[model samples]
Target: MEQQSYTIIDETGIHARPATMLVQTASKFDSDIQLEYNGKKVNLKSIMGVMSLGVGKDAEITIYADGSDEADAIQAITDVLSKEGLTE
Candidate 1:
């Protein structure tokens, strides 16, 4: 398993729209992807799981991936967050 953590930077946080985008991105990967926040772990491929986190600006989130495509999955998802300006 590989893990990476990022601080939320967007003013609106990881709200519904970007959370859905994140789920869509995670869905493209073959590895299992999950997000960790506030001692809770949620499947990154599930919109409901992400939205339920209620993540806000400055919140720290960890992304995890485990499988053959772990590295690629991590890089891809992190890239999306960067592109969306979602990290602090």
Candidate 2:
């Protein structure tokens, strides 16, 4: 497994649009992806799971991945967060 932490930079946090993009990105990977926040673990592929965390600006979230594509999955997610200006 691989994990990386990032702080939410978007003012609205991972709301509808960002959450959807996150889920869609996770869905493209073969490895299992999860987001950890406030002692809770949520499936990255589930939009509801992500939104339920109520993540907001400055909130730290950990993206974790396991399985064959773990490295690639992590890179992909990290890239998304950075490229999309979703993290600090």
Residue-wise C-alpha lDDT for candidate 1, range 36-81, written one tens digit per residue: 8766787655346655664556656788888777777788788765
lDDT of 1 at 63: 82
Each model's TM-score?
0.73, 0.74
* Model 2 residue 48 CA deviation in Å: 0.9
Write model 2 residue lDDT over 1-88, tens digit each, in one string: 8888887665555655666666666777667777877757787554566567656666677888876777777877776665435444
Query: What lDDT does the true structure give each of the candidates?
Result: 0.68, 0.67
Candidate 1 residue-wise lDDT at 50: 55
lDDT score of model 1?
0.68
Best by TM-score: 2
Tell me how far candidate 1 lies from the true structure as C-alpha RMSD in angstroms.
Answer: 2.7
